[PDB]
Amino acid sequence: DGSCTNTNSQLSANSKCEKSTLTNCYVDKSEVYGTTCTGSRFDGVTITTSTSTGSRISGPGCKISTCIITGGVPAPSAACKISGCTFSAN
Numbered sequence: 001d002g003s004c005t006n007t008n009s010q011l012s013a014n015s016k017c018e019k020s021t022l023t024n025c026y027v028d029k030s031e032v033y034g035t036t037c038t039g040s041r042f043d044g045v046t047i048t049t050s051t052s053t054g055s056r057i058s059g060p061g062c063k064i065s066t067c068i069i070t071g072g073v074p075a076p077s078a079a080c081k082i083s084g085c086t087f088s089a090n
Contacts, residue, residue, distance in 0.1 A: 009037050018049075025053070040070060041090040052077070055089040062086070 002008065004017025009025030011017050016031040027042030033049045040053030047057065047064035054071025057064075067080030072089035 012042070015042070028058075030057075039090070045085065050080075052080070055087045057085065057087045059085040 003013055005011060005020050006013065006017065007020060008023045009021035010027065011021065011025065011032070012027040012029055014029055015027050016033060018033045019035050021037045024039045025037035025042065027045070029044050030042045031046035035047060035050050036053055038053045041056040043056060043058040045057045045059050045062045048066065050064050050066045052064065052067045052070040054069050054073060057070070062085035063081070063083050064085065065081035067077035067082065068075045070087065072087065
């Protein structure tokens, strides 16, 4: 019972708790769907089940699609669909 799905990190206590957390995540008014954390930072973002956790993710209307790890890095996610998003390391 860690606030919906926050048992170690912070999903903004107001986003989409559709996935537990590891020990390094602080989102703000966002929407994630079965997404992993491990190491990353969110803030005003609407993403779905995505393995992107490295840098900070923000967007008043950002839309991601799965993709892979992040961290201000492109990574092998050329197949990822990101539109209207602002991120850069965490």
